[PDB]
Design an enzyme around this catalytic site. Structure first.
Site, PDB file in Angstrom:
ATOM      1  N   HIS A  46     -24.439   5.708 -12.996  1.00  0.00           N
ATOM      2  CA  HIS A  46     -24.688   5.767 -14.501  1.00  0.00           C
ATOM      3  C   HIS A  46     -24.053   4.725 -15.322  1.00  0.00           C
ATOM      4  O   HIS A  46     -24.549   4.193 -16.483  1.00  0.00           O
ATOM      5  CB  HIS A  46     -24.426   7.019 -15.233  1.00  0.00           C
ATOM      6  N   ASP A  97     -25.008  10.305  -8.366  1.00  0.00           N
ATOM      7  CA  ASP A  97     -24.498   9.483  -9.338  1.00  0.00           C
ATOM      8  C   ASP A  97     -23.456   8.671  -8.692  1.00  0.00           C
ATOM      9  O   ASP A  97     -22.096   8.794  -8.529  1.00  0.00           O
ATOM     10  CB  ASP A  97     -23.789  10.288 -10.610  1.00  0.00           C
ATOM     11  N   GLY A 196     -14.942   6.449 -19.265  1.00  0.00           N
ATOM     12  CA  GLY A 196     -14.631   5.059 -18.881  1.00  0.00           C
ATOM     13  C   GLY A 196     -13.652   5.362 -17.504  1.00  0.00           C
ATOM     14  O   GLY A 196     -13.455   4.186 -16.993  1.00  0.00           O
ATOM     15  N   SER A 198     -15.208   6.835 -15.223  1.00  0.00           N
ATOM     16  CA  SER A 198     -16.509   6.902 -14.398  1.00  0.00           C
ATOM     17  C   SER A 198     -16.447   5.956 -13.459  1.00  0.00           C
ATOM     18  O   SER A 198     -15.989   4.743 -13.659  1.00  0.00           O
ATOM     19  CB  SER A 198     -17.719   7.040 -15.209  1.00  0.00           C
TER      20      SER A 198
HETATM   21  O1  LIG Z   1     -21.725   9.346 -17.656  1.00  0.00           O
HETATM   22  C1  LIG Z   1     -20.813   9.851 -18.269  1.00  0.00           C
HETATM   23  C2  LIG Z   1     -19.575  10.682 -17.800  1.00  0.00           C
HETATM   24  O2  LIG Z   1     -19.609  10.992 -16.663  1.00  0.00           O
HETATM   25  C3  LIG Z   1     -18.618  10.841 -19.027  1.00  0.00           C
HETATM   26  C4  LIG Z   1     -17.472  11.810 -18.685  1.00  0.00           C
HETATM   27  C5  LIG Z   1     -17.539  13.033 -19.329  1.00  0.00           C
HETATM   28  C6  LIG Z   1     -16.644  14.251 -19.066  1.00  0.00           C
HETATM   29  C7  LIG Z   1     -15.456  13.933 -18.080  1.00  0.00           C
HETATM   30  O3  LIG Z   1     -14.510  14.694 -17.810  1.00  0.00           O
HETATM   31  C8  LIG Z   1     -15.537  12.568 -17.332  1.00  0.00           C
HETATM   32  O4  LIG Z   1     -14.684  12.413 -16.325  1.00  0.00           O
HETATM   33  C9  LIG Z   1     -16.339  11.601 -17.554  1.00  0.00           C
HETATM   34  O5  LIG Z   1     -18.610  10.397 -20.298  1.00  0.00           O
HETATM   35  C10 LIG Z   1     -19.822   9.627 -20.618  1.00  0.00           C
HETATM   36  C11 LIG Z   1     -19.914   9.170 -22.037  1.00  0.00           C
HETATM   37  C12 LIG Z   1     -20.842   8.162 -22.414  1.00  0.00           C
HETATM   38  O6  LIG Z   1     -20.911   7.879 -23.798  1.00  0.00           O
HETATM   39  C13 LIG Z   1     -22.009   7.918 -21.770  1.00  0.00           C
HETATM   40  C14 LIG Z   1     -22.103   8.523 -20.212  1.00  0.00           C
HETATM   41  O7  LIG Z   1     -22.777   8.031 -19.182  1.00  0.00           O
HETATM   42  C15 LIG Z   1     -20.878   9.327 -19.865  1.00  0.00           C
END
Ligand SMILES: O=c1c(O)c(-c2ccc(O)c(O)c2)oc2cc(O)cc(O)c12
Length: 246
Positions: A46, A97, A196, A198
């Site tokens: 993603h 993913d 971030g 990710s």
């Molecule tokens: O793909 C995404 C993602 O996984 C996360 C995320 C959310 C919760 C968690 O606990 C975590 O570890 C990561 O935020 C995001 C925010 C965005 O604006 C766009 C995204 O694509 C993601």
């Protein structure tokens, strides 16, 4: 990372910092990664799905700081940007993913291991730790969901694995967590990954060796009851990893 400590790249030498070149000279951070072999960073799809052009991206290894230079770091171009074909994202969940970036210096060389750069082991097929096992997440993701800045310093924290049986409670995420996902969080609901982080590694002790047990994927919010972090389950993607690193 929400909660947790500041670390340096020496405690997580496999960690990889992926940035995107923007057309007015500007260069922002994108996502984290793990170096699984010299020529191969493994991240999450993603991070790249809106901008799938490998030539936009730079990988850094041996980097403890987000926008200043660590002494040890190597900078890389992306020769191959493999995203998973059957990736799909819904309201929250992201499925399959998992990305792969082959890396190459402008000089042709791959990752040369050092004090600050090392590879990480992939698990055996369908070989994860049991629920309640403690594991390490790492990245430059936000210290709190609501911020508008990333930490300049690399963070890490610890989280317990959550059985799918427990993760799938409607109470939690319910249906949206597949068997190709993996749920980890803190008992107390006060530390987690956040935006971030990710692409970054969820690392568990497996066979007395640090093993890439997950890729940071998604969650609702950062560190809030009773919504764990969800991670791409690396053990179930080894054919895809092995075939595409082949
Ligand atoms: O793909 C995404 C993602 O996984 C996360 C995320 C959310 C919760 C968690 O606990 C975590 O570890 C990561 O935020 C995001 C925010 C965005 O604006 C766009 C995204 O694509 C993601």
């Amino acid at each position: 990372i929400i909660g947790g400590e500041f670390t340096t790249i020496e405690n997580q030498p496999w960690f990889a910092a992926i940035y995107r070149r923007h057309r007015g000279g500007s260069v922002t951070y994108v996502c984290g990664g793990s170096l699984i072999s010299p020529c191969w960073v493994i991240s999450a799809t993603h991070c790249f799905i809106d901008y799938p052009k490998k030539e936009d991206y730079i990988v850094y290894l041996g980097r403890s700081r987000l926008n200043s230079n660590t002494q040890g770091e190597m900078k890389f171009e992306v020769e191959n940007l493999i995203l998973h074909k059957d990736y799909s994202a819904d309201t929250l969940a992201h499925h399959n993913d998992i990305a792969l970036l082959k890396i190459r210096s402008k000089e042709g060389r791959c990752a040369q291991p050092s004090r600050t750069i090392q590879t990480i082991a992939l698990p055996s097929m369908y070989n994860d730790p049991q629920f309640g096992t403690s594991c390490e997440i790492t990245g430059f993701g936000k210290e709190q969901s609501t911020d508008y800045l990333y930490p300049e310093q690399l963070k890490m924290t610890v989280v317990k694995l959550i059985s799918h049986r427990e993760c799938q409670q409607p109470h939690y995420y319910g249906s949206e967590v597949t068997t190709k996902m993996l749920c980890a969080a803190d008992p107390q609901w006060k530390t987690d990954s956040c935006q971030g982080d990710s692409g970054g590694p969820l690392v568990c002790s497996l066979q007395g060796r640090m093993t890439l047990t997950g890729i940071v994927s998604w969650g609702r919010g950062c560190a809030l009851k009773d919504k764990p972090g969800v991670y791409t389950r690396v053990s179930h993607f080894l054919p895809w990893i092995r075939s595409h690193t082949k």
